[PDB]
Design a protein around this motif. Structure first.
Motif, PDB file in Angstrom:
ATOM      1  N   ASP A 180      67.752  21.126  35.986  1.00 53.91           N
ATOM      2  CA  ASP A 180      66.622  20.920  35.220  1.00 53.91           C
ATOM      3  C   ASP A 180      65.896  19.530  34.989  1.00 53.91           C
ATOM      4  O   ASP A 180      66.514  18.655  35.297  1.00 53.91           O
ATOM      5  N   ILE A 181      64.661  20.019  34.852  1.00 55.58           N
ATOM      6  CA  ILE A 181      63.776  18.714  34.782  1.00 55.58           C
ATOM      7  C   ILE A 181      63.794  18.346  33.350  1.00 55.58           C
ATOM      8  O   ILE A 181      63.192  19.090  32.576  1.00 55.58           O
ATOM      9  N   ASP A 212      57.077  11.731  23.215  1.00 57.15           N
ATOM     10  CA  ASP A 212      55.821  12.398  23.183  1.00 57.15           C
ATOM     11  C   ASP A 212      54.415  11.617  22.633  1.00 57.15           C
ATOM     12  O   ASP A 212      53.517  11.730  23.213  1.00 57.15           O
ATOM     13  N   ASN A 227      55.133  25.160  28.784  1.00 55.54           N
ATOM     14  CA  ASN A 227      56.149  25.134  29.557  1.00 55.54           C
ATOM     15  C   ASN A 227      56.538  26.363  30.705  1.00 55.54           C
ATOM     16  O   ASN A 227      57.266  26.075  31.863  1.00 55.54           O
ATOM     17  N   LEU A 242      54.775  25.404  33.811  1.00 55.10           N
ATOM     18  CA  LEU A 242      55.706  24.466  34.545  1.00 55.10           C
ATOM     19  C   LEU A 242      56.857  25.168  35.301  1.00 55.10           C
ATOM     20  O   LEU A 242      57.197  24.962  36.330  1.00 55.10           O
ATOM     21  N   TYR A 265      57.777  25.257  39.231  1.00 52.40           N
ATOM     22  CA  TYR A 265      59.218  24.825  39.899  1.00 52.40           C
ATOM     23  C   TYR A 265      59.752  26.061  40.520  1.00 52.40           C
ATOM     24  O   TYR A 265      60.491  25.856  41.600  1.00 52.40           O
ATOM     25  N   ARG A 297      50.991  24.572  38.685  1.00 59.33           N
ATOM     26  CA  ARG A 297      50.794  23.008  38.056  1.00 59.33           C
ATOM     27  C   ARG A 297      49.452  22.794  37.464  1.00 59.33           C
ATOM     28  O   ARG A 297      49.172  22.336  36.598  1.00 59.33           O
ATOM     29  N   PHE A 347      53.753  19.362  23.307  1.00 60.00           N
ATOM     30  CA  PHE A 347      55.060  19.072  22.943  1.00 60.00           C
ATOM     31  C   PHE A 347      55.859  19.652  24.080  1.00 60.00           C
ATOM     32  O   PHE A 347      55.823  20.783  24.215  1.00 60.00           O
ATOM     33  N   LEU A 348      56.568  18.793  24.979  1.00 59.93           N
ATOM     34  CA  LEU A 348      57.059  19.215  26.212  1.00 59.93           C
ATOM     35  C   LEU A 348      58.522  19.339  25.994  1.00 59.93           C
ATOM     36  O   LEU A 348      59.189  18.475  25.508  1.00 59.93           O
ATOM     37  N   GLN A 349      59.042  20.362  26.685  1.00 61.17           N
ATOM     38  CA  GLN A 349      60.264  20.914  26.879  1.00 61.17           C
ATOM     39  C   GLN A 349      60.953  20.565  28.126  1.00 61.17           C
ATOM     40  O   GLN A 349      60.405  20.579  29.081  1.00 61.17           O
ATOM     41  N   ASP A 350      62.255  20.994  28.290  1.00 62.31           N
ATOM     42  CA  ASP A 350      62.851  20.911  29.589  1.00 62.31           C
ATOM     43  C   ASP A 350      62.521  21.798  30.377  1.00 62.31           C
ATOM     44  O   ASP A 350      62.020  23.106  30.161  1.00 62.31           O
ATOM     45  N   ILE A 351      62.042  21.395  31.722  1.00 62.65           N
ATOM     46  CA  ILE A 351      61.667  22.713  32.751  1.00 62.65           C
ATOM     47  C   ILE A 351      63.059  23.192  33.416  1.00 62.65           C
ATOM     48  O   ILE A 351      63.860  22.427  33.919  1.00 62.65           O
ATOM     49  N   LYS A 352      63.297  24.436  33.128  1.00 58.04           N
ATOM     50  CA  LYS A 352      64.588  25.070  33.439  1.00 58.04           C
ATOM     51  C   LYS A 352      64.523  25.145  35.001  1.00 58.04           C
ATOM     52  O   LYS A 352      63.565  25.470  35.546  1.00 58.04           O
ATOM     53  N   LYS A 353      65.930  24.968  35.553  1.00 61.85           N
ATOM     54  CA  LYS A 353      65.740  25.310  36.920  1.00 61.85           C
ATOM     55  C   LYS A 353      65.556  26.661  37.323  1.00 61.85           C
ATOM     56  O   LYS A 353      65.764  27.711  36.509  1.00 61.85           O
TER      57      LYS A 353
END
Lengths: 172, 172, 172, 172
Positions: B80-81, B87, C21, C24, C28, C59, C77-83
């Motif tokens: 995970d990134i 922010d 998100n 993104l 990924y 992207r 507001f950026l969240q985690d980029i899940k694998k």
């Protein structure tokens, strides 16, 4: 009725005429701002150039609206172009804030025009407003907000260097 | 094992995967910084351009690392990134300081990767890290230090003129 | 609120962040597919090029969405980029089918975003989604469906010649 | 000793001579492969072109090693160039596998040469080996592994179409 008129409500035609008058009024206001910034006791060449260019774009928007009204079979009825609220804008920052307020008002009128075209089931008018008037208005609002933010950050108008350097760098 | 794998330790492969994730996280952080500086209440176009370019370069570094991992016979495993720590970066100077800290952390991870490749007797991995990752990182650290020094000298962020003039002159 | 914010619901802002998100995450996933097809035991150069290009376009879509969010006065507001769900895609045909499923999911989220903007009376957001995100997504879905149909017709993945010839002719 | 010799161990000079002989032997093996693929009962023009080009690059590597040996003050001592293990390579896939094995053996000898230069504290020799011989060798190993993977996937050599289509598309 017109031989080309089809799916064009009279309310939409009246709203288009009102929007034509509003765009002409905005062009007049921008012309007044450019005239203020061309004064000898103000002397901001790029501010005047910016507001003259804005006046020309507002005139172009009004011309495109009149072209749309003729192209839909409507009839253009012109009203008096009211004079701007003031002749002395007191600052570059104050003029930018007033231009932001005017742009937001024009955007709000465009939004009500789009709503009226939506409730009248007018997809061509809705597409015209979205393609040529909404995105450009939102871009102009964002640009004027950026200019206002920068001018407030630099310390305009109490800092005399601020408006001069904004005129040289951002608007030049 | 892979038909092309030769003199490639599993510890080195795991460290390469961890470095891939760290470069992707740095790209995400730079994207967050660019998004912050594109805001209407911030309005620093060249700051946003700088941080977007840094994000793209970090993504390019991660892509080169994944190409190296495939080219050595290793297997890429993506995690995970994680989202950036904040922010709102509050300033151009604060964002430059945070970017300097992130660059130093990435440099430290690269140094430990080079040490692990050295103790595993991996001359190709060491040469790859030295040629493509160490010198560029030290250049980036020096550039960010110069930017931070200039912004502190000008009086950022209390002096509103400072960040604007740095945006116009150094980053423009 | 923001000085440029006008006719922008908080629900629309949250949905825009969720779509950022999701784009993104799709980038990924395409990066993972390209990394898989760059492996020594897979060795499909044009498959990897195709999926890397798709990652870059995803992207770019996320960047355009963040630009829209800043340009409407919203806050990113950026969240985690899940694998991605898997690291081994087992085939060119299987990867194309998974990319088709991902593209359809992104299209469905875009459709719900357009519906939410419609019920909130947001013509600018609706026009933005229709102009820049819907037609391109339907084109991508059609292209991936064509690729899947061709790969199934040639006999992938049991026929070893099929994926190689698709790599040479369609993707090359 | 030589007037230019400085920090050059005799063990390093002997290892450089052995590596010169190994590169010449690899060039001879690639020449044999190209001669096999130019036969009338084999008739693979691009396979022969590939292996002739590989032979020329191995000769260039040996020439660069001899230039390094003269430039460090060492003395070049040439041994017999042994004949290749076979004259009939039986397939394009079998020849690619044998070339992969030869490339891995040359890479292993280069790794031992780098280790010997490291334990003798010879940074110039280490940098020479890393810059001109390690990365190129790993690239060649990856390319040969990709070729072998593709040829096995297509069904070589039992499928007669496979080697022909690989000759036309990948090597052509």
């Amino acid at each position: 009725p017109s031989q080309v008129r089809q799916n064009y409500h009279q309310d939409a035609e009246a709203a288009i005429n009102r929007q034509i008058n509003l765009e002409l009024y905005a062009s007049y206001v921008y012309l007044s701002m450019s005239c203020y910034f061309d004064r000898d006791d103000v002397a901001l060449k790029n501010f005047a150039k910016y507001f003259l260019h804005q006046s020309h774009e507002e005139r172009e928007h009004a011309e495109k609206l009149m072209k749309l009204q003729n192209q839909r079979g409507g009839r253009i009825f012109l009203q008096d172009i009211k004079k701007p609220d003031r002749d002395d804008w007191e600052s570059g920052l104050n003029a930018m804030e007033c231009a932001l307020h005017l742009e937001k008002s024009v955007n709000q009128s465009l939004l009500e025009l789009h709503k009226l075209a939506t409730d009248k089931n007018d997809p061509h008018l809705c597409d015209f407003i979205e393609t040529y008037y909404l995105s450009e208005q939102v871009k102009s609002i964002k640009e004027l907000g950026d200019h206002v933010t920068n001018l407030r950050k630099m310390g305009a108008p109490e800092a005399g260097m601020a408006e001069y350097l904004f005129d040289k760098h951002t608007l030049g």
